[PDB]
Design a protein around this ligand. Sequence first.
Ligand code: 5ZK
Length: 163
Amino acid sequence: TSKLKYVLQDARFFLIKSNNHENVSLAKAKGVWSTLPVNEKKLNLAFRSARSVILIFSVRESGKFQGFARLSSESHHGGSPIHWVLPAGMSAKMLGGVFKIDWICRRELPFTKSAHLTNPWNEHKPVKIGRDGQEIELECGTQLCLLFPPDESIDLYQVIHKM
Ligand SMILES: CNc1ncnc2c(C)n[nH]c12
């Protein structure tokens, strides 16, 4: 876990809520994510400001987090359309900005294991609670990531080089 801690050193953390499992599975396979423009702008700002920006994913109604990943780029808009399963009210143009991500952990964590972690940037509510795009304060974000089971399929050596 030493390289993982190095990656998380001085990182920023954002909670990502997905309305469906399909888009998270697509993101795990293709190494990309898209979000609404309001969160798009926040992530682009954070990417320039921090050694690592970490997205922590939770599919709505799953009672779990599905893993976490590190931004490797700002968003980009002209490309082969990612076949997101679009939520009601969410257009393809809204999700047009595509971030490239490197997965750090593709394993699940149930909300029952994070009940002791609260987020100061969301009124000290349990970290599972938050809107899509909610920033998670450093210490709580770091501890949440360290709770996930190790993903032995990942080699963080390549991630460290991009820092
Ligand atoms: C690909 N991005 C997304 N897919 C499905 N749902 C959501 C939400 C609530 N934010 N971003 C989403």
